[PDB]
Design a protein around this motif. Structure first.
Motif, PDB file in Angstrom:
ATOM      1  N   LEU A 259      -4.798  -0.679   8.163  1.00  0.00           N
ATOM      2  CA  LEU A 259      -5.600   0.422   7.636  1.00  0.00           C
ATOM      3  C   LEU A 259      -6.084   0.042   6.239  1.00  0.00           C
ATOM      4  CD1 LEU A 259      -3.394   3.475   8.747  1.00  0.00           C
ATOM      5  CD2 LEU A 259      -5.148   2.269  10.064  1.00  0.00           C
TER       6      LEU A 259
ATOM      7  N   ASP B 126      -0.583  -2.889   7.855  1.00  0.00           N
ATOM      8  CA  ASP B 126      -0.710  -1.799   8.811  1.00  0.00           C
ATOM      9  C   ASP B 126      -2.085  -1.743   9.462  1.00  0.00           C
ATOM     10  OD1 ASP B 126      -1.840  -1.145   6.396  1.00  0.00           O
ATOM     11  OD2 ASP B 126      -1.058   0.903   6.316  1.00  0.00           O
TER      12      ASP B 126
ATOM     13  N   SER C 125       0.612   3.763   1.929  1.00  0.00           N
ATOM     14  CA  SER C 125       0.814   4.256   3.284  1.00  0.00           C
ATOM     15  C   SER C 125       2.050   3.667   3.953  1.00  0.00           C
ATOM     16  CB  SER C 125      -0.433   3.980   4.131  1.00  0.00           C
ATOM     17  OG  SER C 125      -0.966   2.693   3.856  1.00  0.00           O
TER      18      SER C 125
ATOM     19  N   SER D 134       0.828  -1.193   0.000  1.00  0.00           N
ATOM     20  CA  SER D 134       0.000   0.000   0.000  1.00  0.00           C
ATOM     21  C   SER D 134       0.869   1.253   0.000  1.00  0.00           C
ATOM     22  CB  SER D 134      -0.912   0.007   1.226  1.00  0.00           C
ATOM     23  OG  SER D 134      -1.746   1.152   1.237  1.00  0.00           O
TER      24      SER D 134
ATOM     25  N   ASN E 202      -3.111   5.170  -0.653  1.00  0.00           N
ATOM     26  CA  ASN E 202      -2.629   4.794   0.685  1.00  0.00           C
ATOM     27  C   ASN E 202      -3.546   3.807   1.420  1.00  0.00           C
ATOM     28  OD1 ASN E 202      -0.436   6.897   0.393  1.00  0.00           O
ATOM     29  ND2 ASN E 202      -2.198   8.263   0.656  1.00  0.00           N
TER      30      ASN E 202
ATOM     31  N   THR F  35      -5.239  -0.378  -0.313  1.00  0.00           N
ATOM     32  CA  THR F  35      -5.188  -1.429   0.708  1.00  0.00           C
ATOM     33  C   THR F  35      -6.495  -2.223   0.662  1.00  0.00           C
ATOM     34  OG1 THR F  35      -3.957   0.225   2.004  1.00  0.00           O
ATOM     35  CG2 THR F  35      -4.364  -1.925   3.027  1.00  0.00           C
TER      36      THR F  35
END
Ligand SMILES: *[C@@H]1O[C@H](CO)[C@@H](O[C@@H]2O[C@H](CO)[C@@H](O[C@@H]3O[C@H](CO)[C@@H](O)[C@H](O[C@H]4O[C@H](CO)[C@@H](O)[C@H](O)[C@@H]4O)[C@@H]3O)[C@H](O)[C@H]2NC(C)=O)[C@H](O)[C@H]1NC(C)=O
Ligand SMILES: *[C@@H]1O[C@H](CO)[C@@H](O[C@@H]2O[C@H](CO)[C@@H](O[C@@H]3O[C@H](CO)[C@@H](O)[C@H](O)[C@@H]3O)[C@H](O)[C@H]2NC(C)=O)[C@H](O)[C@H]1NC(C)=O
Ligand SMILES: [Mg+2]
Lengths: 215, 346, 330, 104, 48
Positions: free
Chosen positions: B246, B244, B135, B133, C330, B208
């Motif tokens: 998320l 993560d 992030s 991802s 993200n 994600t």
């Protein structure tokens, strides 16, 4: 001798109990003791066979209470292994409750009642907190007669007094008492006892306590 | 702080406990137990609240942490037949507790060797999922590639050659090595594939989607009307993933995990749970970590940890070179695996 | 489960199998010795709000009840009128203690009125005025509790509130399980716009599960929960529910949040929410409009030709293609 | 012997919830002392079944082998009512006892 | 508000048992006048 930690328990808690084993001189000794725990119906639930040897005559034990259990007066019976005919017992109650914040002591002015006392029976109501402070509120006090185990209440004697500075006074008059039995003779009340019940309610309405002095 | 029970109770666990620099108390959890239940007292870990005083058979207890604290482990535990509670012991984590690099590889190998020495007979599958991802970063992927190379040689150092599966995902899953290949059990060939992967396509599709990745893991282990396979009730599956927590695409990934346990006949019986045939390990890469989501995906086996939270990536590479210096004393004693030839002396 | 009992050996024995469980019968255990009707009404205009509280009680039984205790708790920001308590305390068969009379308007949020009796044939009603000495934006409902002196467990407690019906709090209940609904109705009023800089960043948070564009078909008012039937036109972000073009889903809002929504039939809307707002079993599924659900009105094709909606319709159109073609970064 | 429990701390004021206090346990040497601390809100509901020293001596006094508080009908009736046996070489004895408890 | 102790800073009283202090003590102190005195440091519960 059987010691309990409390006299009343809720479902879900655990009962702690010690057993002190002494001989005929009240000195500690080591024997084999059979321990029973009985329900209100009189049926033993848990049995054990312990020895007080090398323990200085103190036997710590425990028992858990299930969530679903019979209320009432439970019993704990114990006896020596060599003398099963001599059983020693102590009771405890199981009830769903919460703890109060104040006690009510119901004590009459005399520890009896004379028949020809025209003043009646004067009863002092004492109500203080657990930490010693005094209680403001209102009380509800009713008298009654008891012949053996058949109780006969007296609804004519209902009074509502305020409780100021943790104190209160209530009197049962003789004309109200003689009108409750429907008795023209006053000498037939010799032998019977009297019982008083009080119910004090706080000014906030958050708690109340029932107390009773009988016999 | 010190612990001391009442009369007629036995203290097990650490009687003297000390608060350390990582915000956790030292030693084992102190438990006052009377020995009146079929199961033992599960006790109260520090920071939790236990609901359930009965410790009989088929009973249950529920745990809750304090305000602002995240539960790690099982929220509900149930006393099973044999005197062993289901799930794992809880531990209240915070937003800053993390894990030391020594405590990560110490607990991870003590779980992994248990589901290796029962395979001892070629009959073990290991699935590798990596989060690509946006992030995490482009600089934080190639440091995770070199970490995964050290993992394969430690597994092959036990004489067992399992079958590997390499899937890197982000918005879509990309299967590099499938477990249904003729070269997947060759441990040296999969290591050659790990350097040949490139993450330029996953950087374009920044996202994600955890659920669509686990649907590719389900399609690798499922059989298309093959009708009971020979290793259906004898194959240990190990799923290892870094994320993560998320996730924002695809949906709740927990619904794919329950489909996997139903396919492996786990939990569908009362006499045979088969919990040793699926282990799930989740590792937390960054400070941006949802500790609730990583705990619900990982398995909860008894006296064992499967959730890990570390920071700066390079320390997670430090736990993989440390675990190969650590030697595990393999024990062939007391091993009885359920083979269908149940004559005595087996 | 049906089990087997094998008994071997010599002697006699007694087997007993009892199952304890919670039985669903009538729920009639509240108000078993009393009946309590409490209503709060505003006062008429003389020439600082004042309202009239009316309490009526009656004993269930063959005789009139003995001396009983009324536990009146006030709403937050309301105090009784000191002249009206002096009227009832001097009344026949009633008594309010002198400790409660001269408290003034300082602190009198709880009140005990002692009744000498309450009849069993007709309701014994009293009423008094309450002044609002402290205006607060949120008012907690007060309670009236009735019981005799000798048994506190045989009581009954009714609530009163001028807006909510008889002081009940808003909860959402289907099949025994209830969830708290005393929160907000949507997430925020917003109107800040800012397009993707304040809309993509909220939709790409990890809690957001689904993003749909729907159309209201039928509004069904039905007792406890309100039904909003939304036919799904397009799937912007595919959540944990596999749904295609043309299928319908059922949406739930409480009674107090029906006015803030203003949902009309044959209109299109845009809605997103969390994955904890799911409340449906089997392939049937019910969505919850809680305090973590965004609701925005989607104007139709000819409705975007206004110059007031021209700034808003270009915001909504670019939001779809950034999620369909690219997804959440993200 | 003797057993007194008092406050080891020199009175002070009424202690605060959470405060430590010192408890003075005053008893015989080599004695195992067992403890219990009970809320006094328990005795409001039930003041029965308290272990006291006076209830212990009531059990010991009701297990004595002597029945009559004084004298007897003859010389042998003094011993059996006080709980003793006499036997001599001159023939004078006491009556037999086959009941573990007292008459009536 | 800004004055008063912050509500998050207040740690609430939690330990309200009905019975405690169920312990065994052995008077091993040196006996003066036939009397052994053991000083115990106990922690009081949060009940009032
Ligand atoms: C992998 O999965 C398969 C499919 O589920 C599974 O097959 C099962 O094998 C067991 C034996 O290992 C079977 O159990 C027995 O089957 C016979 C008929 O073949 C029955 O008659 C048996 O009943 C009697 O015997 C028992 C003791 O052996 C007694 O306890 C019982 O009271 C009876 O007297 C017994 O059920 C089972 O039927 C099959 N199941 C199916 C669906 O085919 C296989 O064992 C699995 N592999 C492993 C290693 O578990
Ligand atoms: C856990 O740690 C505690 C200390 O934190 C250990 O307690 C130690 O116990 C010994 C008993 O062998 C104590 O000795 C005695 O101390 C009393 C004090 O009143 C003294 O009067 C006696 O003469 C005797 O010396 C010792 O003091 C105590 N330690 C401290 C620091 O007080 C305990 O043993 C540890 N337990 C485990 C299982 O690790
Ligand atoms: Mg991401």
């Amino acid at each position: 001798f059987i010691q309990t930690d409390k006299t009343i328990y809720t479902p879900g808690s655990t009962v702690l109990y010690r057993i002190f084993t002494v001989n005929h001189k009240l000195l500690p000794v080591g024997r084999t003791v059979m321990v029973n725990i009985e329900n209100p119906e009189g049926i033993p639930v848990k049995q054990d066979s312990l020895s007080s040897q090398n323990q200085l005559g103190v036997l710590p034990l425990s028992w858990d209470i299930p969530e679903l259990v019979n209320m009432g007066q439970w019993k704990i019976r114990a006896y020596y292994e060599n003398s099963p005919q001599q059983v020693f017992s102590t009771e405890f109650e199981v009830k769903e409750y919460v703890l109060p914040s104040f006690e009510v002591i119901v004590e009459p002015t005399e520890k009896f009642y004379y028949i020809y006392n025209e003043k009646g029976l004067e009863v002092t109501i004492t109500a203080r907190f657990l930490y010693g402070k005094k209680v403001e509120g209102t009380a509800f006090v009713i008298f009654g007669i008891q012949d053996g185990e058949q109780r006969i209440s007296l609804p004519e004697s209902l009074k509502r007094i305020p409780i100021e500075d943790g104190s209160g006074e209530v009197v049962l008059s003789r004309k109200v008492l003689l009108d409750g039995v429907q008795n023209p003779r006053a000498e037939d009340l010799v032998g019977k006892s009297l019982y008083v019940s009080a119910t004090v309610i706080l000014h906030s309405g958050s708690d109340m306590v029932q107390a009773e002095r009988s016999g | 702080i010190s612990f001391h029970c009442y009369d007629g109770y036995t203290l097990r666990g650490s009687a003297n406990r000390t608060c350390q620099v990582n915000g956790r108390w030292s030693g084992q959890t102190a438990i006052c137990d009377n020995g009146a239940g079929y199961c033992s007292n599960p006790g109260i870990p520090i920071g939790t609240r236990k609901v359930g005083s009965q410790y009989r058979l088929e009973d249950s207890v529920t745990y809750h942490c304090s305000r602002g604290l995240t539960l790690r482990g099982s929220q509900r535990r149930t006393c099973q037949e044999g005197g062993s509670w289901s799930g794992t012991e809880p531990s209240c984590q915070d937003s800053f507790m993390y894990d030391t690099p020594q405590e990560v590889a110490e607990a991870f190998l003590s779980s992994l060797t248990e589901t290796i020495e029962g395979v001892d007979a070629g009959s073990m599958n290991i699935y590798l999922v990596l989060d690509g991802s946006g992030s995490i970063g482009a600089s934080n992927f190639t440091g995770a590639k070199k970490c995964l190379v050290n993992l394969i040689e430690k597994v092959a150092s036990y004489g067992v050659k399992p079958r590997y599966g390499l899937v890197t995902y982000a918005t879509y899953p990309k299967i590099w090595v499938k477990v249904s290949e003729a070269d997947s059990s060759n441990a040296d060939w999969v290591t050659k594939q790990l350097n040949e992967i490139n993450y330029e396509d996953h950087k374009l599709k920044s996202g994600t989607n955890t659920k669509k990745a686990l649907q590719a893991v389900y399609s690798m282990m499922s059989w298309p009307d093959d009708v009971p396979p020979e290793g259906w009730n004898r194959t240990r599956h190990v799923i290892i993933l870094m994320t993560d927590g998320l996730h924002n695409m695809g949906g709740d990934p927990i619904t794919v995990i329950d489909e996997i346990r139903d396919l492996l006949y786990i939990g569908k019986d009362r006499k045979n749970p088969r919990e040793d045939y699926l282990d799930v390990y989740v590792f937390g890469v960054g400070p941006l970590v949802n500790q609730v989501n990583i705990n619900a995906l990982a398995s909860k086996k008894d006296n064992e940890q499967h959730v890990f939270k570390v920071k700066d990536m390079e320390n997670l590479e430090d736990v993989f070179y440390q675990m190969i210096d650590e030697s595990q004393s393999l024990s062939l004693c007391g091993m009885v695996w359920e083979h269908r030839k149940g004559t005595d002396y087996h | 489960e049906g089990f087997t009992v094998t008994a071997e050996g010599k002697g006699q024995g007694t087997l007993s199998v009892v199952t304890m469980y919670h039985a669903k019968a009538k729920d009639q255990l509240t108000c078993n010795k009393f009946d309590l009707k409490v209503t709060i009404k505003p006062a008429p205009e003389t020439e600082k709000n004042t309202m009239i509280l009316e309490i009526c009680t009656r004993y269930r039984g063959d005789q009139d009840a003995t001396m009983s205790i009324l536990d009146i708790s006030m709403m937050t920001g309301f105090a009784p009128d000191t002249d009206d308590l002096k009227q009832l305390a001097n009344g026949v068969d009633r008594y309010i203690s002198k400790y409660e009379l001269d408290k003034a308007f300082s602190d009198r949020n709880t009140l005990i009125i002692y009744l000498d009796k309450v009849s069993h044939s007709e309701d014994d009603c009293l009423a008094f005025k309450v002044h609002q000495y402290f205006n607060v934006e949120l008012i907690q409902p007060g309670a009236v509790k009735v019981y005799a002196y000798y048994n506190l467990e045989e009581s009954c407690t009714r609530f009163y509130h001028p807006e909510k019906e008889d002081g009940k709090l808003n909860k959402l209940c289907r099949d025994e399980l209830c969830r708290c609904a005393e929160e907000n109705c949507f997430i925020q009023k917003s109107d800040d716009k800012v397009t993707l800089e304040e809309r993509l960043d909220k939709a790409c948070e990890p809690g957001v599960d689904y993003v749909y564009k729907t159309r209201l078909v039928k509004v069904q008012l039905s007792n406890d929960f309100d039904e909003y039937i939304m036919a799904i036109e397009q799937t912007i972000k595919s959540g944990s529910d596999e749904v295609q073009v043309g299928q319908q889903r059922t949406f739930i809002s409480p009674i107090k949040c029906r006015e803030a929504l203003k949902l009309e039939e044959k209109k299109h809307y845009l809605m997103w929410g969390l994955s904890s707002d799911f409340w449906g079993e089997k392939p049937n599924l019910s969505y919850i409009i809680g305090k973590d659900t965004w609701v925005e009105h989607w104007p139709e094709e000819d409705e975007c030709q206004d110059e007031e909606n021209q700034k808003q319709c270009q915001d909504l159109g670019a939001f779809t293609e950034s999620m369909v073609v690219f997804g959440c970064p993200n | 012997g003797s057993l007194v429990v008092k406050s080891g701390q020199s009175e002070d004021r009424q202690p605060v919830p959470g405060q430590q206090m010192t408890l003075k346990i005053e008893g015989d040497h080599g004695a195992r002392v067992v403890l219990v601390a009970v809320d006094k809100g328990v005795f409001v509901l039930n003041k029965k079944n308290k272990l006291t020293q006076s209830k212990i001596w009531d059990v010991v006094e009701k297990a004595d082998i002597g029945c009559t508080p004084g004298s007897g009908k003859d010389y042998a009736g003094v011993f059996s009512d006080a709980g003793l046996t006499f036997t001599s070489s001159s023939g004078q004895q006491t009556a037999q006892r086959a009941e573990l408890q007292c008459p009536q | 508000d800004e004055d008063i102790i912050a509500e998050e800073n207040i740690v609430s009283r939690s330990e309200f048992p009905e019975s405690w202090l169920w312990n065994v003590e052995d008077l091993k102190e040196p006996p003066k006048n036939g009397i052994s005195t053991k000083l115990m440091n106990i922690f009081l519960k949060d009940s009032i």
